[PDB]
Design a protein around this ligand. Sequence first.
Ligand SMILES: *[C@@H]1O[C@H](CO[C@@H]2O[C@@H](C)[C@@H](O)[C@@H](O)[C@@H]2O)[C@@H](O[C@@H]2O[C@H](CO)[C@@H](O[C@@H]3O[C@H](CO[C@H]4O[C@H](CO)[C@@H](O)[C@H](O)[C@@H]4O)[C@@H](O)[C@H](O[C@H]4O[C@H](CO)[C@@H](O)[C@H](O)[C@@H]4O)[C@@H]3O)[C@H](O)[C@H]2NC(C)=O)[C@H](O)[C@H]1NC(C)=O
Ligand SMILES: *[C@@H]1O[C@H](CO[C@@H]2O[C@@H](C)[C@@H](O)[C@@H](O)[C@@H]2O)[C@@H](O[C@@H]2O[C@H](CO)[C@@H](O[C@@H]3O[C@H](CO[C@H]4O[C@H](CO)[C@@H](O)[C@H](O)[C@@H]4O)[C@@H](O)[C@H](O[C@H]4O[C@H](CO)[C@@H](O)[C@H](O)[C@@H]4O)[C@@H]3O)[C@H](O)[C@H]2NC(C)=O)[C@H](O)[C@H]1NC(C)=O
Ligand SMILES: *[C@@H]1O[C@H](CO)[C@@H](O[C@@H]2O[C@H](CO)[C@@H](O[C@@H]3O[C@H](CO)[C@@H](O)[C@H](O)[C@@H]3O)[C@H](O)[C@H]2NC(C)=O)[C@H](O)[C@H]1NC(C)=O
Ligand SMILES: *[C@@H]1O[C@H](CO)[C@@H](O[C@@H]2O[C@H](CO)[C@@H](O)[C@H](O)[C@H]2NC(C)=O)[C@H](O)[C@H]1NC(C)=O
Ligand code: NAG
Ligand code: NAG
Lengths: 613, 100
Amino acid sequence: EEKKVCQGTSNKLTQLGTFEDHFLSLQRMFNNCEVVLGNLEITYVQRNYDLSFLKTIQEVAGYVLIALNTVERIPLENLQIIRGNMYYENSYALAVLSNYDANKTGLKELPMRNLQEILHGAVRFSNNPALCNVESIQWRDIVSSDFLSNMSMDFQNHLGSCQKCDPSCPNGSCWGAGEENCQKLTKIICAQQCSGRCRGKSPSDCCHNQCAAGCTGPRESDCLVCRKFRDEATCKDTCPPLMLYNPTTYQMDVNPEGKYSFGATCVKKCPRNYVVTDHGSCVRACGADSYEMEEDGVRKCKKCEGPCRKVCNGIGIGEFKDSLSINATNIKHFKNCTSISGDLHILPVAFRGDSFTHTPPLDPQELDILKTVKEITGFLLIQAWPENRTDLHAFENLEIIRGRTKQHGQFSLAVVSLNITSLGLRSLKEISDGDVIISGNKNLCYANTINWKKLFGTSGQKTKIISNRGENSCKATGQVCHALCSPEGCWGPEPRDCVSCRNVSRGRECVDKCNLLEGEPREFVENSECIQCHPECLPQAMNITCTGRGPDNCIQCAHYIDGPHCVKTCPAGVMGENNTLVWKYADAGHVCHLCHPNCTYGCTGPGLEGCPT
Amino acid sequence: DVPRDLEVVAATPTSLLISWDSGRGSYQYYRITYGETGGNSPVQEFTVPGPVHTATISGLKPGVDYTITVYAVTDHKPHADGPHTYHESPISINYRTEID
Ligand SMILES: *[C@@H]1O[C@H](CO[C@@H]2O[C@@H](C)[C@@H](O)[C@@H](O)[C@@H]2O)[C@@H](O[C@@H]2O[C@H](CO)[C@@H](O[C@@H]3O[C@H](CO[C@H]4O[C@H](CO)[C@@H](O)[C@H](O)[C@@H]4O)[C@@H](O)[C@H](O[C@H]4O[C@H](CO)[C@@H](O)[C@H](O)[C@@H]4O)[C@@H]3O)[C@H](O)[C@H]2NC(C)=O)[C@H](O)[C@H]1NC(C)=O
Ligand SMILES: *[C@@H]1O[C@H](CO[C@@H]2O[C@@H](C)[C@@H](O)[C@@H](O)[C@@H]2O)[C@@H](O[C@@H]2O[C@H](CO)[C@@H](O[C@@H]3O[C@H](CO[C@H]4O[C@H](CO)[C@@H](O)[C@H](O)[C@@H]4O)[C@@H](O)[C@H](O[C@H]4O[C@H](CO)[C@@H](O)[C@H](O)[C@@H]4O)[C@@H]3O)[C@H](O)[C@H]2NC(C)=O)[C@H](O)[C@H]1NC(C)=O
Ligand SMILES: *[C@@H]1O[C@H](CO)[C@@H](O[C@@H]2O[C@H](CO)[C@@H](O[C@@H]3O[C@H](CO)[C@@H](O)[C@H](O)[C@@H]3O)[C@H](O)[C@H]2NC(C)=O)[C@H](O)[C@H]1NC(C)=O
Ligand SMILES: *[C@@H]1O[C@H](CO)[C@@H](O[C@@H]2O[C@H](CO)[C@@H](O)[C@H](O)[C@H]2NC(C)=O)[C@H](O)[C@H]1NC(C)=O
Ligand SMILES: *[C@@H]1O[C@H](CO)[C@@H](O)[C@H](O)[C@H]1NC(C)=O
Ligand SMILES: *[C@@H]1O[C@H](CO)[C@@H](O)[C@H](O)[C@H]1NC(C)=O
């Protein structure tokens, strides 16, 4: 059956407004909810507030937190499972804490008579002076053995005005008064023969591996709850794959019966406002290592190129208002920042420290934070640099300087009075606006080689490169451009320091050749770039190894041949057309061939022979 | 806005009744930590609701020097999507448990 869903919350112990607002928002979120995709957090609920709406809840994907409540009763009567996909305080799937007041009254009853399963995580019970019956509970039937060591159970009252468990309860374990509140056991009472859950002690009374909490029968269609996924009326280990193996083309085709995973549910399409992930799941929003893109009308998550784009403020604007430089205190805020909205100042006051503003000296190791910066909206002004660093190392990934705002309203790039030997600006591709000043850098040797008119966006942009190391002494001491650089100049001596190469390149480096016939990792040429061959291409003597990327572009396979592909191993267990697995074996010539159709688990050779039997 | 007057008000060889004043301030809750002043093993902790200013620390070892800290905690937002206000104001005492 398809259930009513809700997001859940992640407020931990945070209060939202007054006790009334907090309640109203708790109610708005969980009212009529059957399955919580996130966490169920019930906090700050005052005496006499009605929590009857909680009766509808039956599944919680994350954790359950019940803290600082004053209500006598929390009717979570139908909660069957807590999946523990997320923990509270690094270890708990269930945490019931400090549910009392000044008089030592509070939560008396938490009748969780249907809670039979806690897939992951431990249970914490702390400081609930009014709580009844829960101390009787046998958590060994509820919680996975891996977590019994991490349990945190503290129970205490006076007599706490508690009713005893019904005589009919096993080992006297109950959730409250009455026989309906007895602990139903489905793990500890099982036969030794049983894999997981059971509906009784007998071998007949045994649940399908795919069941969670309990079952009504022994099929994967008879589970109370699905241990992993529910595809319509059945519990399955995974959803029908989105892609399937086509034995004819050897190509992975889109599965017409393919299903996306939404929570612990298998869906043909993600619900409205949900994003598709790189693993078949429906998600509310993309991760930290990924951005969203509405490719083919469907919103999708794509792992972002390098570090994910973070546009953040320059010196003098946001947090950085009234700050004179990138300094010991502020440098932390520049963390994974890729774009700077405004200017960047690196002045002597940073390295020396400032009494008046309580800024200690900057530790030169901290400058490595700036390696993520690829774009500067304003200008870059460097009047101080650690004397032991030969380069502007921190700015090695800086691609563009915009010059929207300029130093003294003129310069977009100001590099002044430093011990640097080279401008380590190998990524600098554009100076959109503003002038460029490079002066007083006594040891600076390469500035003069660059074709600044290439970098410059407009004409009118000028350079003031003077008072550096003598251009003759640079030449005289070999401090010139690598022979592989184009006449377009360099940022330093290394072949990675060129503006452009005269021939080929491997990565950021200008090279004399690509590994076409001789190299360590074999390569092909695309747009004067040495691109590696797939690892499955067998290197060739006196001939090219590959004609492009992938295992479909090898001259010869290194391990196995699966039609047009070179494979490290033959396809085994990949899903094919009409819900039947593809299993292949390798012959004497290393060629992958389909297993006999009766080899539902895989084979070592042809026919029923290489198949036990 | 600074709690004050953390004090042991009643004690047995293994239990302490601690008390403090919240003052001109309101906290959502209090984080109580305790451990041997030593102490090698990490501190034990529990949370006490904002409206309560008394606590029982149980299961202590007699004759041991303990450090007891109370962090008065501010943990609110005006709305689910609002700015988080989170602050901790600690008070602490040292107390030695009595011989059995
Ligand atoms: C807690 O949830 C209760 C369940 O509601 C569902 O879940 C929530 C989360 C929402 O998604 C909701 O839309 C779901 O239905 C909830 O009870 C429900 O309350 C709604 C209104 O809030 C009721 O629907 C509206 O009322 C009538 C329906 O007529 C009959 O309702 C019941 C029978 O089911 C009986 O009371 C009578 O026979 C009524 O005749 C409609 O007239 C109305 O339509 C529209 O009215 C105008 C039209 O211009 C506009 O304001 C809107 O467009 C309205 O849509 C609504 O359909 C719903 O019947 C009721 N559910 C049930 C099963 O009874 C409860 O209110 C929630 N708690 C709180 C405090 O909100
Ligand atoms: C892409 O460009 C690379 C650089 O291009 C060269 O330099 C620019 C400025 C132009 O002059 C351009 O025309 C040049 O080709 C290129 O690398 C170069 O490739 C050649 C040929 O393979 C290399 O020459 C051979 O090596 C040495 C050269 O002696 C010195 O040369 C310079 C001096 O500054 C320095 O690199 C070293 O000090 C060297 O020691 C010779 O010993 C050698 O012998 C030949 O001798 C005779 C010919 O008279 C015959 O027996 C054979 O032909 C021998 O092979 C060659 O002359 C050159 O060194 C190399 N330069 C560098 C810096 O790598 C690369 O091949 C191009 N790649 C592609 C994919 O096109
Ligand atoms: C080093 O970087 C820090 C930023 O992390 C700079 O500290 C900030 O300095 C300014 C003054 O220089 C402070 O602003 C002042 O704030 C009060 C109100 O709080 C206001 O009335 C004043 O007119 C003034 O604007 C700011 O609060 C301060 N603190 C922080 C944490 O940002 C520091 O100045 C930098 N030093 C150098 C030499 O670069
Ligand atoms: C900044 O750095 C990275 C992105 O470049 C992110 O955090 C990293 O990845 C995981 C978190 O998902 C953790 O291992 C660490 O927090 C980070 N690891 C490393 C090696 O840096 C995240 O976007 C940012 N993290 C912080 C702490 O600022
Ligand atoms: C400064 O200048 C040169 C640069 O080649 C070199 O000796 C070193 O990097 C620096 N020396 C000191 C003492 O800072
Ligand atoms: C450069 O900076 C300091 C100089 O005191 C020191 O750590 C070392 O000599 C250098 N190397 C690194 C990695 O910082």
